[PDB]
Write a protein that binds this ligand. Structure first.
Ligand code: HEM
Ligand code: HEM
Ligand code: HEM
Ligand code: HEM
Lengths: 143, 147, 143, 147
């Protein structure tokens, strides 16, 4: 569980990285598809081959980060605030939970890569705890 | 790798009691039920939308038997498992892309099904031990290419 | 998260397997040490080599199952009802989270092995969800 | 396994920019901080009870450098990684018993540290890709014996 401290740290980071989220999400998604090809199976409907340069991915990049920005805004109830993404992911698309870890990593990687001075050891801990909690909320509708 | 006579014995002896067409279907069925995200891989099985759909679907029963035949291939080639699983690795991990950890999950479900069938007096800590070293190898031989 | 249905299923199973818990826990712990030797590193203080036959393990077997019986009794707040086991495990002993999965498996294995007719597919789902939730409560004090 | 010139190039080129004594300490330090259950393995490092204890402890910095030297062993023997990691596998997985998934965690932390050091214009999707295929191999070569 996220502690109030954890929430406070995620809030300071997010406020700081916001706006740039769109490029961070394009990057994060773009890197997962390329570095962990097993994830591409969930995006085979998309066209040009999947990297940061394809439009679908760069647009879906801002999409994920928007949802993440929204999760931060409801950090006190990710479950309730994320039930529709969960029904979509866990129920409709049947995404393997094991992939949530992959996206998270690519996201933290992008953040540290963009705001290195601000992604200190303590922040890295909280943001990792938050992303882990996010996946938990999204895994809600599996079974 | 290093198998002892005691290990080959326990494993062979256990595979020899098991009825593939009975444990297979039940195991593959549980995988789909207990861990529903695994359903995405068997879209060609038709109706598996509910637990009774699953438990009754003959395509699921058929495939469960194919899995047990795949395991027989290893019990038959215990010292070359990795090489004899050359095809199954590629399929599951280079073509289908089943996350590695799912191999472990089905490995666990089968063990559990093996357990509920024979009891604590056949599936002893000693057997359970040789058996687990066996599945750990299968699991390792099944994955790779994804990374 | 456990649904009320999930709780109802765990309750019916537990009531049914209770008493025998002591032998189930001896079995579960006894099997983890033997089948997953990496776990023995947490019990090196114990004597005779670790199997179901050693006293320490057979007694600690009833111990775990007692705590589990207690978790079932506070199924509506595993976090609050498990904070001391968490501080002990996650903070004091520094147990690797990855091992919670191992014990759970050996426990479900024992249950199915003892009450096979009662460990139907639907029960297996709930009991697995519960054990997963239990580990989550115990991982509370890690960071 | 199958490394292309493009891959060897990107990897070699990246290992060649990296300052081991700087990324190593930071990486091993983060492992201990972010995933505190890993502390149980380094009980011989003395004071690492707090995050500043950790960040300042010279034994942690020293060991972080040993880890980067261990990685250099692979970048130097990219086509025999598994065999050259014969000792490190045994130590970590047969003697110490580090759960496999921790290898992945440190692999991720280093990548992240590599990322925060060089930026998106050196650590490009293309490099990031060759690099990840590299760590996936190291990780696989480091574990085994536990099962
Ligand atoms: C854990 C963090 C995640 C977040 C915050 C996230 C967020 C979202 C959002 C905001 C959408 C767009 C929904 C809509 O159009 O209604 C979505 C859709 C989707 N997500 Fe996720 N997602 C996450 C993880 C993943 C992962 C791990 C995968 C699998 C590799 C994935 C696969 C998909 C797919 C396939 C779609 C539908 C896309 C389309 O064709 O339009 N997502 N996700
Ligand atoms: C004990 C572990 C497993 C064994 C031994 C095993 C064995 C097999 C065998 C023998 C085949 C037939 C291969 C061929 O066409 O040559 C197969 C195919 C397949 N397996 Fe597995 N398997 C295992 C685990 C899994 C898991 C965990 C999943 C899913 C999450 C999976 C998904 C599939 C799929 C999707 C096919 C082909 C099906 C289709 O085209 O619809 N397998 N497996
Ligand atoms: C996830 C389910 C678990 C439950 C319900 C459980 C429960 C308990 C209980 C009830 C105690 C006794 C506490 C006391 O004496 O105050 C305890 C202690 C302990 N547990 Fe766990 N445990 C679990 C998992 C594990 C795992 C995964 C490991 C590691 C392999 C582990 C390692 C230990 C150790 C080393 C002790 C102290 C033992 C001694 O020397 O007396 N436990 N646990
Ligand atoms: C990128 C992955 C890793 C690499 C390349 C690596 C490399 C090394 C190297 C080069 C050594 C020195 C070996 C020797 O004595 O011959 C070592 C020792 C050690 N490593 Fe790792 N390691 C990795 C991950 C880990 C992880 C994740 C843990 C802990 C959770 C760990 C725990 C240890 C321990 C405990 C020692 C010996 C320390 C002592 O006796 O206090 N290593 N490692």
């Amino acid at each position: 569980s996220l502690s109030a401290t954890d929430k406070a740290r995620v809030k300071a980071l997010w406020d700081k990285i916001e706006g740039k989220s769109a490029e961070l999400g394009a990057e994060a998604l773009g890197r997962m598809l390329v570095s962990f090809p097993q994830t591409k199976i969930y995006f085979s409907e998309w066209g040009q081959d999947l990297g940061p340069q394809t439009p679908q991915v760069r647009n879906h990049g801002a999409v994920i980060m928007a949802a993440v920005g929204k999760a931060v805004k409801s950090i006190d109830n990710l479950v309730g605030g994320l039930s529709q993404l969960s029904e979509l992911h866990a129920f409709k698309l049947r995404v393997d939970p094991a992939n949530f870890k992959i996206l998270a990593h690519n996201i933290i990687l992008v953040i540290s890569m963009y705001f290195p001075g601000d992604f200190t050891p303590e922040v890295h801990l909280s943001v990792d705890k938050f992303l882990a909690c996010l996946a938990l909320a999204l895994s809600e509708k599996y079974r | 790798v290093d198998w002892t006579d005691a290990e080959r014995a326990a494993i062979k002896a256990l595979w020899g009691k098991i009825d593939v067409g009975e444990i297979g279907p039940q195991a593959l069925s549980r995988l789909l039920i207990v861990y529903p995200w695994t359903q995405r891989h068997f879209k060609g099985f038709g109706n598996i939308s509910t637990n009774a759909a699953i438990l009754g679907n003959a395509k699921v029963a058929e495939h469960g038997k194919t899995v047990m035949g795949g395991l027989d291939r290893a019990v038959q080639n215990m010292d070359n498992i990795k090489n004899v699983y050359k095809q199954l690795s590629i399929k599951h991990s280079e073509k289908i892309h089943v996350d590695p950890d799912n191999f472990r999950l089905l490995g666990e479900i089968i063990t559990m099904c093996v357990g509920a069938k024979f009891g604590p007096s056949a599936f002893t800590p000693e057997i359970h031990e040789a058996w687990q070293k066996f599945l750990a190898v299968v699991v390792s031989a099944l994955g790779r290419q994804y990374h």
